């Protein structure tokens, strides 16, 4: 099948946060069925970024989620055609970040194209002052909507001096494959841990890792 046990990916990202323009590229590999991946990322324009790289972390890969148990895999089923995701991330101190992404498969390699537009981040807040220290692990809930899926999660950004800043993520996932040929799951949940492994040169070069595992809720049901 098209998604092999090892997959490479290449990524192109461009956009703006609060009027600061930038571009990134990355190359990566992972194990789509084990739910693991690594990406090595380069800021190729507008670096050193004047804001926390952490706010871009979730915009760098749904093919690499271990969909356990029954779970029909909306993302892996989507190939050869691929899929798109779009998201608004709303931070509790005011920043808003929208991201739109295309995922395709070309010559056995996954190709990501991402555009980013972030606004209203407070100039003396932790994002613009780079007072952040990576993301807590997080759980996303996904559900059928409009012949695709939608996802929701609340994520917690660790802060210098302890404490967290929370943001809310509203995602929409659309398959490029005809409905006729796709089995869309019911409600399910993805648990993840996204971690920066290394950085160099004020986050001009970042290595990021994720482990992600989809599950149904395990708890017994009275109904």
């Amino acid at each position: 099948e098209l998604i092999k046990e090892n997959m490479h990916m290449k990524l192109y990202m461009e956009g703006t946060v609060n009027n600061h323009h930038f571009k990134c590229t990355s190359e990566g590999e992972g194990k789509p069925y084990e739910g693991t991946q690594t990406m090595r990322i380069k800021v190729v324009e507008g670096g050193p970024l004047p804001f926390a790289f952490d706010i871009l972390a979730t915009s760098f890969s749904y093919t690499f989620i271990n969909h356990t148990q029954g779970i029909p895999d909306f993302f892996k089923q989507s190939f050869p055609e691929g899929f798109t995701w779009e998201r608004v991330t709303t931070y509790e101190d005011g920043g808003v970040l929208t991201a739109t992404q295309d995922t395709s498969l070309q010559d056995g390699c996954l190709i990501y194209n991402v555009k980013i537009r972030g606004v209203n981040f407070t100039s003396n807040g932790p994002v613009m002052q780079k007072k952040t220290l990576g993301w807590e692990a997080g759980t996303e809930m996904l559900y059928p909507a409009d012949g695709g899926l939608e996802g929701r999660s609340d994520e917690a950004l660790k802060l210098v001096g302890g404490g967290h800043l929370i943001c809310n993520l509203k995602s929409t996932y659309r398959s490029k494959k005809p409905a006729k040929n796709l089995k869309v799951p019911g409600v399910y949940y993805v648990d993840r841990r996204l971690e920066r492994i290394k950085e160099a040169d004020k986050e001009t070069y970042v290595e990021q890792h994720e482990v992600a595992v989809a599950r149904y809720c395990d708890l017994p049901s009275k109904l």
Side-chain angles (χ1 to χ4, degrees):
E1 191 247 42
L2 318 106
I3 300 306
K4 307 202 175 329
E5 205 76 50
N6 293 104
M7 294 295 292
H8 198 86
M9 68 222 67
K10 305 176 191 176
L11 167 151
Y12 312 82
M13 173 186 296
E14 181 179 4
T16 342
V17 168
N18 273 25
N19 237 271
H20 298 287
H21 186 275
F22 68 96
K23 292 193 198 197
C24 301
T25 60
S26 70
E27 317 208 291
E29 323 77 26
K31 295 163 128 308
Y33 297 96
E34 293 171 50
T36 58
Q37 67 182 310
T38 296
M39 289 208 107
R40 291 153 281 111
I41 302 153
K42 314 197 282 208
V43 178
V44 300
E45 189 171 329
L49 294 180
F51 59 84
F53 190 94
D54 282 326
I55 75 172
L56 303 181
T58 60
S59 299
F60 301 95
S61 184
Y62 279 71
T63 307
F64 297 88
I65 299 163
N66 175 4
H67 281 74
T68 67
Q69 311 179 85
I71 308 163
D73 194 329
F74 186 81
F75 309 95
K76 296 187 188 74
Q77 292 177 78
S78 279
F79 303 95
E81 291 81 3
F83 61 86
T84 63
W85 64 258
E86 48 203 317
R87 181 178 294 140
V88 52
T89 298
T90 307
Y91 286 80
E92 291 185 3
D93 61 351
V96 177
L97 173 103
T98 71
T100 55
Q101 197 264 23
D102 182 275
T103 298
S104 60
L105 174 71
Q106 303 176 36
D107 295 327
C109 187
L110 291 165
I111 309 291
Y112 304 157
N113 232 275
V114 204
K115 283 83 58 215
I116 291 214
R117 201 147 304 273
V119 298
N120 201 66
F121 286 86
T122 54
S123 47
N124 317 112
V127 167
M128 296 314 289
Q129 297 298 309
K130 306 193 232 161
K131 292 288 131 84
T132 73
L133 298 169
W135 295 98
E136 294 296 344
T139 288
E140 175 180 13
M141 186 246 264
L142 299 87
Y143 62 97
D146 305 284
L149 295 177
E150 281 178 32
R152 293 288 181 279
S153 73
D154 285 273
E155 307 281 318
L157 184 47
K158 300 146 112 162
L159 296 185
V160 165
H164 293 92
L165 171 61
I166 309 309
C167 53
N168 168 264
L169 287 58
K170 292 179 178 73
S171 305
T172 302
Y173 309 104
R174 317 184 202 252
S175 178
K176 262 133 75 214
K177 167 174 262 146
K180 200 170 253 63
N181 303 294
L182 173 91
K183 218 267 135 206
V184 176
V187 174
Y188 72 102
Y189 307 86
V190 169
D191 304 314
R192 28 165 94 80
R193 191 189 295 278
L194 187 164
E195 299 177 293
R196 175 175 314 166
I197 306 311
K198 279 204 135 206
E199 68 85 27
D201 190 23
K202 297 162 135 89
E203 291 79 36
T204 303
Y205 306 87
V206 168
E207 182 187 345
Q208 201 173 278
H209 182 85
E210 192 181 31
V211 49
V213 176
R215 54 165 174 97
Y216 286 122
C217 176
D218 257 343
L219 297 176
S221 167
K222 280 271 192 290
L223 302 291

